[PDB]
Design a protein around this ligand. Structure first.
Ligand SMILES: [K+]
Ligand SMILES: [K+]
Ligand SMILES: [Zn+2]
Lengths: 364, 5
């Protein structure tokens, strides 16, 4: 009944070392601790993924390359472009150990769910959904979401993956493109030039997986009410058509107002309504993080969502803690949306929803 | 290939 929280001090220190999000893991954990939420959870130490575990998805050649460049942090290896290492995914010293740690944490959370230790297991430092079997991408070196789904598959016949990160969950969608046993649903910004460039509403998967990929392309400036209306509409239809046995939910906070990417205009309350809708299904649920580049806001978001999972109302005042001085200028838990336009036209959203409904008739 | 970032 009590949610599992994947945590150890060593794991947070490892996750803190990614240069695209330095110290973020510590900020998220410190805020959760400051609100005393960890006392309401079952704290489980993550295992480190073995080569065999990582190889359930990633190719041997890619894993061996990552291991090789990780030794000295060789960021100029002849084969690195081929393997997606470069500006977004640099070959830093020890990056293999980092990858193995996050892969292992999501696998540990999935195992907790299989064993019935909990109905909800949380790995806020996971969710690296862009990585491909043989290629790093989008700050992701190992696709822990795919590894977690593959572990859950041992017990759960149909798994629903829901991806609320700002960016299209392309690595997870591609991994499961050809199967009807895992349905992927991504809501994301979709615009020419915007990473990774995929995920139009017409992208529905392939072969036996046709219609078991769902993409909801959204324009800039979306706020809580409209986002929740879209998310609820799609998830209601998906749940009815697909009848999942377990859910993996990626909650990247790069949609939240104040993110330097400045694309969506969401608050944690809106994402929380989506989370509540999914929790009401009462299925085994693996909760992951993902993007989020305003570090204090990402901690605000994931702390608030941890409160949602626990059914608790948190104080609006950020408690004093290690990183309190980073919570200005308001020092409150709530995030105020920016005063910019929502570029989502109601007719286009209607069209997208109609198209998705038509696709889901084939799953039914 | 797009850049993220
Ligand atoms: K997404
Ligand atoms: K699929
Ligand atoms: Zn993202």
């Amino acid at each position: 009944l009590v949610p599992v929280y994947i945590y150890s001090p060593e794991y947070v220190s490892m996750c803190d070392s990614l240069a695209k999000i330095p110290k973020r893991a510590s900020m998220v954990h410190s805020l959760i601790e400051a609100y005393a939420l960890h006392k309401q959870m079952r704290i489980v130490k993550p295992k480190v993924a073995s080569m065999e575990e990582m190889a359930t998805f990633h190719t041997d050649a890619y894993l061996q390359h990552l291991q090789k460049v990780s030794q000295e942090g060789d960021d100029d290896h002849p084969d690195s472009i081929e393997y997606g290492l470069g500006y977004d995914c640099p070959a830093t010293e020890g990056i293999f150990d980092y990858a193995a740690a996050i892969g292992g944490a999501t696998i540990t959370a999935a195992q907790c769910l299989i064993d019935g230790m909990c109905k909800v297991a949380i790995n806020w430092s996971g969710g690296w959904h862009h990585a491909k079997k043989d290629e790093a991408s989008g700050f992701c070196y190992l696709n822990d979401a795919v590894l977690g789904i593959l572990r859950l598959r041992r017990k759960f016949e149909r798994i629903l993956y829901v991806d609320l990160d700002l960016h299209h969950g392309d690595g997870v969608e591609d991994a499961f493109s050809f199967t009807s046993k895992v349905m992927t649903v991504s809501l994301h910004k979709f615009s020419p030039g915007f990473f990774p460039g995929t995920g139009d509403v017409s992208d529905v998967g392939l072969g036996k997986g046709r219609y078991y990929s769902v993409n909801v392309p959204i324009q800039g400036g979306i706020q809580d009410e409209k986002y929740y209306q879209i998310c609820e509409s799609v998830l209601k239809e998906v749940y009815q058509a697909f009848n999942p046995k377990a859910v993996v939910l990626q909650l990247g906070a790069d949609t939240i107002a104040g993110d330097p990417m400045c694309s969506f205009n969401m608050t944690p309350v809106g994402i929380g309504k989506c989370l509540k809708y999914i929790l009401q299904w009462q299925l085994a649920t693996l909760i992951l993080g993902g993007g989020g580049f305003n570090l204090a806001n990402t901690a605000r978001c994931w702390t608030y969502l941890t409160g949602v999972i626990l059914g608790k109302t948190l104080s609006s005042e950020i408690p004093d803690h290690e990183f309190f001085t980073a919570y200005g200028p308001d020092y409150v838990l709530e995030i105020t949306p920016s005063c910019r336009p929502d570029r989502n036209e109601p007719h286009r959203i209607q069209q997208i929803l109609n198209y998705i409904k038509g696709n889901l008739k084939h799953v039914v | 290939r797009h850049k993220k970032x």
